[PDB]
Amino acid sequence: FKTIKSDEIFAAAQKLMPGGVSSPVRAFKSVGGQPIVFDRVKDAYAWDVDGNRYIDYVGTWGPAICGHAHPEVIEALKVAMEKGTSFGAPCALENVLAEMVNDAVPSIEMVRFVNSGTEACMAVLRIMRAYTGRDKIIKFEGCYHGHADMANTLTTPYNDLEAVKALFAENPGEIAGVILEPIVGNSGFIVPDAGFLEGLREITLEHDALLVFDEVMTGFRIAYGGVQEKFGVTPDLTTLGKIIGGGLPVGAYGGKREIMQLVAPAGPMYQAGTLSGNPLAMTAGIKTLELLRQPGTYEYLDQITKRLSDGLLAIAQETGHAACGGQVSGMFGFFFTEGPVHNYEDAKKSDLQKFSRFHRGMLEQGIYLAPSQFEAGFTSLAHTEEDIDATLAAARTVMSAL
Amino acid sequence: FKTIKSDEIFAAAQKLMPGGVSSPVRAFKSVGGQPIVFDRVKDAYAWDVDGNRYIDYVGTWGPAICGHAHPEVIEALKVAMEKGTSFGAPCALENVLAEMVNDAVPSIEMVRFVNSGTEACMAVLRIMRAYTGRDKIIKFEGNTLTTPYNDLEAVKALFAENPGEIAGVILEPIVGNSGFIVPDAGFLEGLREITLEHDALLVFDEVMTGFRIAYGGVQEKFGVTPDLTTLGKIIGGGLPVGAYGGKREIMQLVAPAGPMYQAGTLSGNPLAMTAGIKTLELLRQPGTYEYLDQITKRLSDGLLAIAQETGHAACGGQVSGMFGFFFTEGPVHNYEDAKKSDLQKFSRFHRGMLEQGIYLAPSQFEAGFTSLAHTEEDIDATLAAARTVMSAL
């Protein structure tokens, strides 16, 4: 297992960019220290600059749900770019993607496209405060909503309704609303307990506060309508990203019409994006959603991912390793702790030392997993039953050691 | 001049998105409210959904400096996308662009790529505070302290009023967001001196000026080096991109190198890097910036000469392929002056130009842009249209 070229490229990168990456997690410092430089990706695979091929479970963090470089998405992009890469003015593609999104997400009646999950969460934090006239916002420890700066931020344990109620009591008429990942993926994979989302919906309504779902990662993955549709709980606002861009930089935030009306130039809340509604980004997103509309899509994702997760758990047992995990559609998690995992605190009980060795072993078996214990794993419509079998055979080999 | 399809599309848009647009300025509010919907762009032109062709002076706000849909940029993108549109991991292209950006910009010794000018400025404001340990920042009109652009005395005053509290000063070395406004002689130098004097950072927002005013931007053009600068647009070839860099030791604070957290799941996108690398290479060809200054100087002068002959009060100016034209006698030194402009006249002017086949920024407070694709004839035709429109008004 050679990674010479990656080391060469990474070494050079450290003198050009901070830590030699465009995003901190890529630096592998939490699972080793020596990341692998990608050359190309296709379907369920990615290839090293050294020629090593991997069965990918990162899917560039969520967008590649139809597989890397889907022929139809690429063909669509080829045609679209002949028309120019950016307009800086309105184009019909924006209407189409917006209409598709409104039809897909229960809470979305009006949308605004931006360029990243960060920009979307940033903008939604502002409509929240602008609309309610209140400044404090409630978020959960472990949840990630971009690197937007945000004393006005109250935090609480994920899956803790009583902690949420307490914050409202301690801050009467000061809570603009509650924002969260209806299903966590940024502190490992964590599903909401029975009644948690509903409860959040009940208390926010009770206090005229907004319920905001960050579905940047779960949107169009957990279900076409995302978690909100899947679990039948409708927020007032929700953010989107990744998948709706089909690989290109994209983001979006929308929800109830009367709230979105505050967004400029409709309303006073100023939010701008010079290259927003990018025609290439719109094209890939549209094609990606149409593909997701085909028959058996989500059934297939759940099918192969449930088998993956279970197998991973069965193998940990057989090999004598404590572990817990779970999966909903094509999103899963695997922790090295007996758990169960209900919040970030639990998740951190994981044997990070072991995960590190496990991650590297898997790498040597040609499997590419998220370089961190606190990241959900992803599957795609391109992953074959064989890819799942191969991933499990690899898991056994690696865990049989450890 | 029919705009039926644009009207239908924009009408439908308002029931789907806030104001029927992705960015406020596209709504044409300050110029009639009847935006035109683009279908495609090429070279120096843009085409309506109604089939109307325009000589474009917006260039999607700066990225199209080598022309719209340049054959070599598109070819490079086609070739790159066979390898995937996004990795979520390091790729060689990042090193290539990062290195080219370092070589090009005087103050940048280390860069971090992001996905927008917004993310970059957002990150730079954070390194400023993180690095100085101070919370207040000075910006210019047009924890936040503001002052009139081109007012060194107003800036000195803020420092005296907040001893040891100013992390630094951030600005567009050349203004384009409140109309085109050049820095008066000694201004940028002055800012450099006072920031240095108070151990405060000097930050240049060259998202719009970078690689346009000059390969090295305004900081290179005017010989004034900041400690940190943000980039965008052009380095992306049209695709969403952004970047911030500067002194090595300051950038070391950026995660994972340092404690200041800033992330971008899709940052360093291979398609954006490819298009950015190809655009910079094209700009490295012979006579590029001399060409931009040549046609843009003629355009601006003619625009001013025409206003004169038609009896309209106006002022403007241009540096490289960036210009401004205000309907006020000026001169314009700051936003306050810019606001004396006859917006009512501008609107009528902007529409009449649209009718003559010329697409200008739908706002008096936006700089104009030219590209290597604009030919002498396009400039001729633009001035000829300028006269027709201003002969009326």
UniProtKB/Swiss-Prot annotation, chain B:
Name listed for the protein in its UniProt record: Glutamate-1-semialdehyde 2,1-aminomutase
Species in which this protein is naturally found: Synechococcus sp. (strain ATCC 27144 / PCC 6301 / SAUG 1402/1)
Family according to the record: Belongs to the class-III pyridoxal-phosphate-dependent aminotransferase family. HemL subfamily.
Quaternary structure annotation from Swiss-Prot or TrEMBL: Homodimer.
Listed GO MF terms: glutamate-1-semialdehyde 2,1-aminomutase activity; pyridoxal phosphate binding; transaminase activity
PANTHER family in the record: GLUTAMATE-1-SEMIALDEHYDE 2,1-AMINOMUTASE (PTHR43713), GLUTAMATE-1-SEMIALDEHYDE 2,1-AMINOMUTASE 1, CHLOROPLASTIC-RELATED (PTHR43713:SF3)
Reactions listed under catalytic activity: (S)-4-amino-5-oxopentanoate = 5-aminolevulinate
EC numbers, comma separated: 5.4.3.8
InterPro entries assigned: 4pyrrol_synth_GluAld_NH2Trfase, Aminotrans_3, Aminotrans_3_PPA_site, PyrdxlP-dep_Trfase, PyrdxlP-dep_Trfase_major, PyrdxlP-dep_Trfase_small
Gene name of this polypeptide: hemL
Enzyme class: isomerase
Superkingdom as given in the UniProt entry: Bacteria
